[PDB]
Amino acid sequence: KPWDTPQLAAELERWKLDGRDVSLLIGGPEGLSPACKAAAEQSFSLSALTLPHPLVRVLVAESLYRAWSITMKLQLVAVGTKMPDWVQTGFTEYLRRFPKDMPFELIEIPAGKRGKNADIKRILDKEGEQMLAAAGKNRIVTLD
Amino acid sequence: AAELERWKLDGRDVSLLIGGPEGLSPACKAAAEQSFSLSALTLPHPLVRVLVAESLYRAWSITTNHPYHREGSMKLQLVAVGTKMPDWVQTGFTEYLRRFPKDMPFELIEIPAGKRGKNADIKRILDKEGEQMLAAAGKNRIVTLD
């Protein structure tokens, strides 16, 4: 019922047992057809789907570009968690073709490696220490 | 929509800080002149079928990597209303799809989204979309996602 790997993994393995091919239906923003709800053999919820953290700075960049346009230097200092396989190479290009008069720059701080081993209190410490260095004497605006 | 333009940088260059997924330093937070909440950002509807395709690949990769196998015959068909992709991911999703193992019997079927307007029937829009969705699904078992 929730959309997550263990749920999806189990379903995949009993779907191969019926023989039938499987179609997965994703409707529009407002939802699916009613004749889709009636035709479903089963349903999953997509409410566990959250914005992946690497895309947060992407959206922030876009939103600043979009607020600059409603018409000195604006510096986005972000931890650069590895971006999704599908997205990367596509942001670097999107940034390269930002308007040459928008005073913007993306400054990415390498991410400390998180793991079952790592205390994140001390990963956050290094990241912030370098972020504050990069921000210098500028006006400081946190986004959290 | 973007009335943030009220931001009135005058004097100093402005530094906007985005921490990791777990948040910002004590020093960062202690140094903040302003803070701004950062989750009505919500993730765009076009990216749902991106994430679903990523999820499916991942689920497929783990399950068929079992010490016991032979998936053989069952195709998966992702049938998705194709709302316009954001620019920043324009054809990285296309390139992403070329990298799926051809082992994986996967197909993505994008159904043309109807133009949503300043006044758009919506009732009509989704019902047309459903019929193209079901028609593309044929006799497959139907699993709905939302």
Curated annotation (Swiss-Prot), chain A:
According to its UniProt entry, one GO biological process term is: rRNA methylation
- Which residues are listed for S-adenosyl-L-methionine binding in this entry? 27, 46-51, 143
Q: Which SUPFAM superfamilies match?
A: alpha/beta knot (SSF75217)
Q: Can you state which reaction this protein catalyses?
A: pseudouridine(1915) in 23S rRNA + S-adenosyl-L-methionine = N(3)-methylpseudouridine(1915) in 23S rRNA + S-adenosyl-L-homocysteine + H(+)
Look at the named UniProt entry and state the broad enzyme category this protein falls under: transferase
Q: Which InterPro entries did the record assign?
A: Alpha/beta_knot_MTases, RlmH-like, tRNA_m1G_MTases_N
Molecular functions per Gene Ontology:
protein homodimerization activity; ribosome binding; rRNA (pseudouridine-N3-)-methyltransferase activity
Which keywords does this chain's UniProt record carry? Cytoplasm, Methyltransferase, rRNA processing, S-adenosyl-L-methionine, Transferase
User: Which Pfam families does this entry report, sorted A to Z?
Assistant: SPOUT_MTase
Q: Give EC number(s), comma-separated.
A: 2.1.1.177
Reply yes or no: does the keyword Methyltransferase apply: yes
Q: Name one GO cellular component term.
A: cytoplasm
Disulfide bond sites: none
Q: What is the effect of changing residue 62 to A/Q?
A: Loss of activity
The subcellular localization recorded is:
Cytoplasm
Please give the subunit comment from the record. Answer: Homodimer.
Q: What does this protein do?
A: Specifically methylates the pseudouridine at position 1915 (m3Psi1915) in 23S rRNA. Specific for fully assembled 70S ribosomes.
Q: Which HAMAP family did the record assign?
A: 23SrRNA_methyltr_H
As for family, the record states:
Belongs to the RNA methyltransferase RlmH family.
Q: What is this protein called?
A: Ribosomal RNA large subunit methyltransferase H
Q: Which organism is it from?
A: Escherichia coli (strain K12)
Gene name, Swiss-Prot/TrEMBL: rlmH
Curated annotation (Swiss-Prot), chain B:
| Superkingdom | Bacteria
Record EC number? 2.1.1.177
Q: Which residues bind S-adenosyl-L-methionine?
A: 19, 38-43, 145
Q: Which GO terms describe its molecular function?
A: protein homodimerization activity; ribosome binding; rRNA (pseudouridine-N3-)-methyltransferase activity
Q: Name one GO cellular component term.
A: cytoplasm
Reported impact of residue 58 to A: Decrease in activity
Question: InterPro entries this protein is in?
Answer: Alpha/beta_knot_MTases, RlmH-like, tRNA_m1G_MTases_N
One BP term from GO: rRNA base methylation
What keywords are assigned to this protein? Cytoplasm, Methyltransferase, rRNA processing, S-adenosyl-L-methionine, Transferase
Subcellular location(s) per record: Cytoplasm
Q: Which reaction does it catalyse?
A: pseudouridine(1915) in 23S rRNA + S-adenosyl-L-methionine = N(3)-methylpseudouridine(1915) in 23S rRNA + S-adenosyl-L-homocysteine + H(+)
UniProt keyword S-adenosyl-L-methionine, yes or no: yes
Q: Effect of altering residue 68 to F?
A: Loss of activity
Per UniProt, subunit arrangement is: Homodimer.
What family is it from? Answer: Belongs to the RNA methyltransferase RlmH family.
This molecule's function is given as:
Specifically methylates the pseudouridine at position 1915 (m3Psi1915) in 23S rRNA. Specific for fully assembled 70S ribosomes.
The record's annotation in PANTHER family points to: METHYLTRANSFERASE (PTHR33603), RIBOSOMAL RNA LARGE SUBUNIT METHYLTRANSFERASE H (PTHR33603:SF1)
* Name of the protein described by the UniProt record: Ribosomal RNA large subunit methyltransferase H
Species assigned in the record: Escherichia coli (strain K12)
